[PDB]
Each structure stands twice: as C-alpha cells, then as structure tokens.
Amino acid sequence: GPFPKATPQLPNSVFDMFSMKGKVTAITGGGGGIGFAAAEAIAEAGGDVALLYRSAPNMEERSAELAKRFGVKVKSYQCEVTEHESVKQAIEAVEKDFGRLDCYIANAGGGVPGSINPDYPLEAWHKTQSVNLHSTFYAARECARIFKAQGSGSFIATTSISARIVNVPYDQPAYNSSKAAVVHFCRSLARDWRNFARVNTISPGFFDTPMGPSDKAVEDVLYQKSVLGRAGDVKELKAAYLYLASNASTYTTGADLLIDGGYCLT
Amino acid sequence: GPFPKATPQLPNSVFDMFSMKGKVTAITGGGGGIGFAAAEAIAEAGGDVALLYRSAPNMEERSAELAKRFGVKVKSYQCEVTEHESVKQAIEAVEKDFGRLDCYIANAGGGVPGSINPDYPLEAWHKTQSVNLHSTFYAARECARIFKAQGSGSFIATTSISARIVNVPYDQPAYNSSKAAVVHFCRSLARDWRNFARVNTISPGFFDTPMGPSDKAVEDVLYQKSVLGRAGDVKELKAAYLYLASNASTYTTGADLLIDGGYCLT
Amino acid sequence: GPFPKATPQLPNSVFDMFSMKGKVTAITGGGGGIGFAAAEAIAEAGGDVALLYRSAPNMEERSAELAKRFGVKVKSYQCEVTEHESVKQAIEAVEKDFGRLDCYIANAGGGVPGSINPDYPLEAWHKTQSVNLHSTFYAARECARIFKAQGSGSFIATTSISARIVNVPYDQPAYNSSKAAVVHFCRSLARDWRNFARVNTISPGFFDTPMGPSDKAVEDVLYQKSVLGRAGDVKELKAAYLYLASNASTYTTGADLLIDGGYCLT
Amino acid sequence: GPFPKATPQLPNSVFDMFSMKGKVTAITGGGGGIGFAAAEAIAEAGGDVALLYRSAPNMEERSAELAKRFGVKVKSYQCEVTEHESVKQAIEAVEKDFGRLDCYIANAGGGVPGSINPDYPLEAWHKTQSVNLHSTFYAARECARIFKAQGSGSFIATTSISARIVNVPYDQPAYNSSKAAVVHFCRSLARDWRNFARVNTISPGFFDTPMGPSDKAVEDVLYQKSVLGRAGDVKELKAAYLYLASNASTYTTGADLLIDGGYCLT
Ligand SMILES: NC(=O)C1=CN([C@@H]2O[C@H](COP(=O)(O)OP(=O)(O)OC[C@H]3O[C@@H](n4cnc5c(N)ncnc54)[C@H](OP(=O)(O)O)[C@@H]3O)[C@@H](O)[C@H]2O)C=CC1
Ligand SMILES: NC(=O)C1=CN([C@@H]2O[C@H](COP(=O)(O)OP(=O)(O)OC[C@H]3O[C@@H](n4cnc5c(N)ncnc54)[C@H](OP(=O)(O)O)[C@@H]3O)[C@@H](O)[C@H]2O)C=CC1
Ligand SMILES: NC(=O)C1=CN([C@@H]2O[C@H](COP(=O)(O)OP(=O)(O)OC[C@H]3O[C@@H](n4cnc5c(N)ncnc54)[C@H](OP(=O)(O)O)[C@@H]3O)[C@@H](O)[C@H]2O)C=CC1
Ligand SMILES: NC(=O)C1=CN([C@@H]2O[C@H](COP(=O)(O)OP(=O)(O)OC[C@H]3O[C@@H](n4cnc5c(N)ncnc54)[C@H](OP(=O)(O)O)[C@@H]3O)[C@@H](O)[C@H]2O)C=CC1
C-alpha cells in the first residue's frame, strides 16, 4: 500500500500493553507444563483462553478453576495436532464459542529420539515432523483466515534450543530438524501475514516439565552447558508468552526468543 | 557447585515478576528516545532510575518530572561514555546515592557513517568503536564488582539490526561492527557473570528518534524491508527493557531481543 | 575410544587434497544445473560419479559423455527422492555397481510456492517437505550404514538462502521451512555420524538454472539484494562441492557454505 | 540500470578456478601456523606471497625457501598490525615490490584473556581490540584503494569460533567480541566494496598452533565439544584459504567459513 503504513496508537502504560482484555487465545499442549503456565499469564492479563489438549486428564475441571481464579472465560478442547481436521475443527470451535481469536500458541510437541540409520523407523521420522512441524502449519493455515478478517493477530510457536543446537548425548536429528523448520516457517509467516498479524517463536532450553531432561546423563550435560546450572522453571516463560501475545510487542515480528539459561552460549 | 543450582523464587503473578520496586536502574542515553522510554517503563514498574546523559538539556527537570509521575527516585548524572573515568564515576555516584545497582542499560550510541577507504578518518573509526563498544566494556567492568557483591544483576545493551545486517544505502562498517562486537561481548559476559548476573541485548530496527532513518533514501529502504512498512515508536521497546530488567526473565541470559518490524526477515 | 582422536594423514599438496581418485560420489538432481556442475567438478578431480535423476532426458548418453571426457566411471540411476524405497534402491545399486560410496549429494529439490492460507493445499505442503526434507532423511538413513561400514564418508545437502532468509515477492513458507529443516538436520547428523563421516550443506543464492528467478519481479529483488547485482552461474558452486566431497575439508563438519553473491547481507 | 551486471570470466575447469598465477597475496601472521599454511596453499596454486610478520625469526630465509619451493615470488615485511602506519607501510611496500595486491589475509591475532571486572586492565581490552579488530580496519582502509584501481580483490580475515561461541573455562570476552566485530565488519565491507572486491572470513576452531588449547582443561573441553575429538591440523585450513583467495569463489561474498570439527554444534 502507501508508505509509511500507520503507526498504531499505543498505550502510555507499559502494563496496559500487556493486557489481554477482550482478546481470545488458543493454546495447544494446554494441559502441559509450558502451555498451562502461558494460559495462567494470559488469564491474569484478562484474556480468555481456549486450552487445547489430547490426552491430559481433568481439563474441564482445570479450565473451570483457571476461569474462576482470574474472572475470564476458559474452555477446553480436544485436539490431535497431527490431524489437520482436528486442528481446524478446534480453531473453528474456539472462533464460534468465543466470537474471535487473537492469539494461537502452537505449543504441543514431541517426537521420537534416535540416531539416523536403518534402525530408525520411517514412521518415527514422520510422527516427529507431524507433531512439531505439520501441526504448526495446520494451525497457521486456518488462523490465517481469522487473523486476516480481524485485521490483527498473534501467532506463537514454542520451539526449542534444539532448533539451533544439537542435543547430546541422545541424538535426535528428527526433532531438531522439525523445530528448526518451525523457527524459519514462522519467520516466513511473519512476512507472509505482515498486513494482518505478527508471528514469533519462543525457544526454551531445558525446563522442569515431563519433556525436560530424561535422565542423569542429560542433566549432567545441562549443568555444564546452562551457565545458570539448572533447568528452567515454567514461571520463567510466563512473561515471554504474554509479551508476544499482547500489544507489548507490536514491532516484534519474525523473532525467536531464546530462554535457555545460557545453554547455547558455549 | 553443587548442581542443580537453586531455582530463584518468583511470584505467582506474571505482573509481579516485572516489578522494579527496591531496584535501581542506570540508563545511558537517558535523555534520548529509546533511553527515556526505557526509564518510563522501569519507573512505572516502581523502579528507581539514574538517568545518564552527556549533552541533553533540562535533565534535572525531566528527572524530577519522571520521579513525581511514578513516585520513584530519579536523578541525572553527567556521563561521557567514551571515557572510562566518566563511566566509572557515574556508576559509583549512583551506587553511593541509591545504595545499589540492579540494572545497567548501556544505551548510549552513535558513530560516523562512511565507506571504508583512505577518506575514512582513523578517528571516525575509533570514535564509533568508543561510543558503542568501549563504553559498554567500561560499564560492564565496573558493574561486575557491584553485581558480584549483590549476587544479582541485569546488564542490558542496546545493540541494533546493524549488528546482524548491513545498512544501505549509506555504508557504515564501523557502526555495524561495533554493535556486532557488543552483542557477542554481552553473550561472553553472560557466561563470565554466571554466578551473579544476567546479560542480554535488545536489537532495535529503525525507530522514530534522532538516530532513525537519515533521509528519504533510508526511509524508502525501511518501508520495503520492514514487513510492517514503518519505523518503530519507542513505546514498543518499553516492555522489552522491563522484561530483561526484571524477574520476568530469570532464565533469559545471553539473548538478543530482535525488535525490528521484520527488517531482518528480508 | 580415547582422546585425542587421531589426526588424518594428509598430503602436503593442497591440490592433492581435492582428488576424488578412488572415491565414488552419488548426486541427486544429477541432470540438473547445480547437480551436473558438481558432477563435472568431481569427475575432473578423478572421482567416479553416480548420476541420480527422475525425469531428466538423455541421462545415459550424458553419463557416457562425462565418463569419456574425464576418464572416470559415470552411471545414471533413476531415483524418485520423495519415496524411501527408490532412494534406498538407488544407493544400494551404486554401492553394488561401484563397490563403495564415499560421498552423497542430496541435491534434488523443489516445492510449491504460495502464501499460507486455506487456498494452500495440504498436499502442496507435504509435497514440498517430501522433495527437500524427507528425501534428505531417506538418503541419510541408508548412507549411515555404508559410511560407518567404511569408517569414512561425506554427506552434502544443497540447501538455499531460503533456509535463513524469506523470499520475496512470492511467499513460500513451505519451501523455506523445508530447507531450514535440512540445514539443521545435517548439523544433527554431523554430531550423530561423528565417528564415521562428515556432514555439511551448501546454501546457494539465486543461480541461472530452471530453479532460478521465476520472473522479472524476482529478478528486480535479486539485483537489489545480491551485492554483485546478478544471479550466480553454476560454475561458481563447483569448487564448494569438490571442497566438501574431498580431503580438502577434513576438519569441516556441521558447516553451511553460503554462496549467494551477498543476498543475505542486507 | 546497469542490471544485470555481467558474470565474470569463469574457467570451465574447477582446478583452473583455484589458480593464483599472476596474483599477489599479503598475509599478516605470515610466520605463524595458519598464516604460513595459507601461504603454502597459495604458493602451490602459483600465487606470489608477501609474508607479513612482527617478531617471527628467520623470515627472509623462510620467504626465500617458500619461493624456491614453488617457483613463485615470496617476500617478507615487518608489520605491527596494531599501528595503522605500519599496516599501510607494509601494504604500500608490497604493492610496489609485487606490482599488485589481489588478496589480503588479515590473519594476525592475539589478545589477553580474563574475566571482565576491575582486575581486567583497560590496556588489555584495547590491546585485544587493536590486534584483532583495528588491525583489520587498518588493512581494509588501504586495500580499498588498490582493489578499486584493479577492479578486483579478495579480502579475508581469520576470525574464530570465538566470534560465535563463548570460550570455556577461561573467560575472554575481549577476544570473543573483537572476533565477532571482525566477522560483521567483513560482512559490511562485502557490501561496501561490492563493485571491486569480495570479502569473507574463515572461523577456525581449535588448531594445533601456539594459539591452540592453552592447557589440558581447554583440551578436555575441546575433546568433548568438537565431534571429531581432536584439534585441527593447519593443513585442514589450506584449501579454504585458497578457495576464498581465488576464482573458485566468485559468487561467495560476506560468508563465514566455519572450520571447527563441529565444536559449535552442541
Ligand atoms: N520442557 C523442555 O525441556 C522443553 C520443551 N520444549 C517444547 O515445549 C512444548 C511443551 O512441552 P512441555 O510443556 O515442556 O511438556 P509437556 O509434556 O508438559 O507438554 C507437552 C504437550 O504436548 C502435547 N502433545 C504431544 N503430542 C500431541 C498431539 N499429537 N496432539 C495434541 N497434543 C500433543 C501434550 O498434550 P496431552 O498431555 O494432552 O496429550 C502435552 O500437553 C513442546 O512443544 C516442546 O517441544 C522446548 C524446549 C524444551
Ligand atoms: N533510532 C534507531 O533507529 C536505532 C537506534 N539504535 C541505538 O539505540 C540507542 C539510543 O539511540 P536513540 O534513542 O534511537 O537516539 P537518540 O539520538 O535519542 O539517543 C542517542 C543517545 O546517545 C547519547 N550519546 C551519544 N554519544 C554519547 C557519548 N559520547 N557519551 C554519552 N552519551 C552519548 C545521547 O546523549 P546526549 O544527548 O545527552 O548527548 C543520546 O541520548 C543507540 O545505542 C543507538 O545506536 C539501534 C537501532 C536503531
Ligand atoms: N537455482 C537456484 O537459484 C537455487 C537452487 N537451489 C537448490 O539447488 C538444487 C538443484 O536445483 P537447480 O540445479 O538449481 O535446478 P534444476 O531444476 O536444474 O534441478 C533440480 C533437480 O531436482 C530434481 N528433482 C525435483 N524433484 C525431484 C524428485 N521428486 N525426485 C528426484 N529428483 C527431483 C530434478 O530432477 P529431474 O529433472 O531429473 O526430474 C532436477 O534435476 C535444488 O535442491 C534447489 O532447491 C537452492 C537455492 C537456489
Ligand atoms: N590456533 C587456534 O586454535 C585458532 C586461531 N585463530 C586465529 O588464527 C590467527 C593465526 O593464529 P595461529 O596461526 O593459530 O597462531 P600463531 O601464534 O602461530 O600465529 C599468530 C600470529 O599473529 C601474529 N601477531 C600477533 N600479534 C601481532 C601484532 N601485534 N602485529 C603483527 N602480528 C601479530 C604473530 O606474529 P609474530 O610471531 O611475527 O609476532 C603470529 O604470526 C589468529 O588471528 C588467531 O586469532 C582462530 C581460532 C583458533
């Protein structure tokens, strides 16, 4: 269009920039460590939250608790992120029940570790790519229509240090490549969607979660590589999700927030 | 050690993590666009602010206004950042006056554009390195002592997109290299101050300040490179400075926050 | 077992380091611009070459021309890279016909451009990931066995500037993702395969092949962004492939060679 | 509209691309491990070489021996890279004695290690910056004139993994930041000089030279971080320097060749 494009009117108050009042956020892996923490940050900011889950229990009860706690709307939705159909239906259910969708957090993830050789099953590769990469694309694709119609939107993917670093001692090229794919996929989206949305990623290091250090051997690697000598606590991501989800970050697009206690420094 | 290092207690509330109450932040370039915006964010979070300036007028008046606005202590200090003695003295004055120093924001910057050839004065090169790079080292060196004695601290340097990309059409290798040096200097400090401080950088794209686009030619490059088709407003750096300065970001260290409206996506 | 690992015995002659005498190289996209250029480089260096193609015509005669021109063995193999069985069968045919496999160049690529939209078919996404990413995984999976049996190998993937920047004016997140994925997949393999092989990528900018600038609007961007103001000529990639394929690069692993005429600088 | 710019004269033979016959290369740190290896690669390719040294003994003999060995012209020059006049004096002498200057390799380096705190002398910071960063600027400044007159040139800086990662266990933010500075300074020159020169860097990991692993604690870090479990041998750099100095790399500008045995992967 004509240049320069309009600078938005912006709150004089930094805390007001963080407000999620009147805004709707959907979060996959909603029942998990990072996902629920993000939900708590956003619910505290006054935002309504859709918690998307697959196998997590008590989600209706956990939703009701979060809603009561913060005085916002929280509803849980079953969503199998490897299935486009399920990803789409969850998004359209959120749009229908809430009236809009301002933020999608593609936070569900997983995969299967292993060296690359003929002992690595072909399905292990594709399940891994499906859960981290294809899932993000299925969500983005459908969000694109909502965000374009609203003229606004914020897409966040939870990536990993594995997108830029190679995990040791348990090789996992599949998971590493799938997360790197997401990082640059989101960057491409930031340009693609420049007229109606921002797109950013958060790359956590090791966090105290069921997806954190699997055993003593990875813990020992963590204590050496993390300059802080410890795994993160999920509260330490809360502000970063809220930062990207809100008007705190209206000039932040195509960015990857590295929250890793210095893991990637050495 | 031992390992794991202890987690740091954090409030249950995401907004309480941003609180700067009881904490002291010193900010060079404190009379300037980005530096005063940062000061406003920190004062809003209840933090005390030392405003470090060189030639900016009415700093005593502007400091008192900010103090009254937010109900915090604000005091200005003359500091020439290319002189280690001036940098050291301002740091020691704030330490003496406020009793502590929790966050130093190495935000002052400048330099001289020009192609690298025999018409580029040696002093231009050295003034540019002094104002961006040496200044930061001078600050870090004296902050190290205070942070180590406190066992806590947050060091922030304002870098630039110029640390990772090359500006056009006006060549400025000196400025670009000086900002790249600061980004990795800071990354080096994050490992080095491990036991007592976090250190991070904020890399703005072009912002509407006296250091924003030189002329129409730079403007035209910005309008097509930035996917948002405009320069930033310093309000949109505010939340990022507070993020890093506070307990919002306790597992964030060695990071470079890119806030560039997509300039670097390409 | 113990450290340090043995330093390889190497020629005093730098030109001898480039020799591909007694080495077998397999190259997907072998009938294409970049792939045949690399074949010419390796044939000249005295290497035997397996040319892997899908639809390219006259491959038996082109192979014959190359073999005669350079006095090496050259054979063509039909290989559809989106299918694991065809990738594996080609690799195993080469191993049998040539007796060994020293270097594999995962050079075939493609994809479907387009904005991420409900108008972007799921099939287009998966076709794009298949030809660039899955293909590379399928080759690597099978090479791992040969390479470790041998105690040596060099895996090379042709990536793109699209791995690290986003292409304009024609959005293509699928392709950009898939190439980013390959870059870090190869980095993960470099660690994975550390005892028996080296793994590196070459990321070309725009080159004059059928995969080069698709129209005048892409050309105009290229002229602005490449500091050299032109597309590459495939001869300008030849040395980089020979460098990685040979003993010229025995301490080079996990690297991404950017050959882009400065496309990524600004 | 002089776009597109003509593609240079490109040898059809990959080995002819590496030829340095009729080309003059000046190498600081010429008496050192990497520098002399670079000189041998370039002498073998038929290039004339100026060995620039500060304190290295027997340089007149070592030059004469390299010249006789390869049948090229080799001369030595006393050059203190921290002083602009000495850098310029050596450049102008080379130009006068050899007639030309096609390639400058800013290879000299050093510095003083240490944590950043009041015990790190201001002089130590400035020495470190001078030897790595300012030296490179001093060379570039004067090379620009020669390259402009020639319409051609290849500027190479020897950087380090330290430009991209943080060394451990012995902190060295000064050295790290200076090297990072040089990487992006070079990237900036690649654009600046785009009409008459190419500009690239080579980032070695630890190599077996007096600037290699200082003690067994560094060695132990090296053996666990580099996937090849050993320090580099200087022969393993030769081909990379030749690659950048010659027509092997005519579309390669603004690139950083990482040659680190995978040190930066994990
Ligand atoms: N913790 C760590 O050390 C790190 C984590 N990450 C990333 O953070 C994200 C969240 O993980 P985290 O909270 O740590 O761990 P959790 O195990 O607590 O959460 C992971 C979530 O992924 C969901 N999930 C997995 N597969 C599917 C699927 N097929 N369909 C729908 N949901 C699925 C799970 O849902 P459910 O339980 O309902 O089945 C679960 O809630 C992941 O993307 C992970 O890759 C990145 C770096 C580090
Ligand atoms: N605006 C932009 O587009 C971008 C700016 N930046 C960086 O942001 C930072 C702040 O600049 P910004 O706020 O935009 O512009 P301003 O011009 O408003 O601020 C620049 C500040 O630097 C101070 N300064 C310059 N030289 C010295 C010196 N020798 N000693 C002490 N102070 C000095 C000035 O202080 P005083 O007036 O008191 O002399 C001034 O406050 C700089 O580091 C700049 O490099 C990075 C990317 C983009
Ligand atoms: N040219 C450019 O500007 C750039 C190209 N690249 C990459 O370089 C590589 C080579 O392309 P380039 O030489 O430029 O272009 P070409 O079109 O000349 O060659 C591309 C090759 O890809 C092969 N191919 C495509 N799909 C398949 C498939 N499904 N199975 C087997 N082979 C397949 C084609 O084989 P066939 O014809 O036999 O069917 C063809 O030989 C690609 O990976 C591309 O992504 C990267 C950056 C820039
Ligand atoms: N070896 C390694 O592990 C690594 C080395 N590097 C870099 O490689 C480059 C070469 O080092 P390398 O060959 O390994 O080690 P050497 O010690 O063999 O070489 C270092 C060279 O730098 C020269 N030098 C130092 N200070 C000055 C000065 N003030 N003026 C002129 N010359 C000076 C020395 O010259 P003289 O003897 O004549 O005084 C010497 O030839 C350096 O830039 C270093 O930073 C980068 C990564 C790793």
Numbering used by the authors:
A (entry chain C), B (entry chain A), C (entry chain D), D (entry chain B): 7 to 272
Publication text:
Recently, for the production of (R)-3-quinuclidinol, 3-quinuclidinone reductase (RrQR) was isolated from Rhodotorula rubra. The purified enzyme from R. rubra is specific to NADPH as a coenzyme and stereospecifically produces the (R)-enantiomer of 3-quinuclidinol from 3-quinuclidinone. Based on the amino acid similarity, RrQR belongs to the short-chain dehydrogenase/reductase family. Therefore, RrQR possesses a novel mechanism for the stereospecific reaction led by a characteristic interaction, in which the hydrophobicity of I167 and F212 plays a crucial role in the stereospecific reduction of 3-quinuclidinone.
The crystal structure of RrQR was determined at 2.2-Å resolution and refined to a crystallographic R-factor of 0.192 and Rfree of 0.230. The asymmetric unit of the crystal contains four protomers of RrQR. A clear electron density for NADPH is observed in each protomer, and the structures of the four NADPH molecules in the asymmetric unit exhibit similar conformations. The crystal structure of RrQR shows a tightly associated homotetramer. Like other SDR family proteins, the RrQR protomer can be divided into two domains: the core and small lobe structures. The NADPH cofactor is located at the bottom of the cleft. The bound NADPH is in an extended conformation, and the nicotinamide and adenine rings are about 10.5 Å apart. Among these residues, R60 and S61 form hydrogen bonds with the 2′-phosphate group of the NADPH; these bonds are involved in the discrimination of NADPH from NADH. In this reductase, residues N138, S166, Y181, and K185 correspond to the catalytic tetrad. A small space is found above the B-face of the nicotinamide ring, and is assumed to be the substrate-binding site. This small pocket, with a diameter of 7 Å and a depth of 8 Å, is formed by S166, I167, S168, N173, Q178, Y181, and F212.
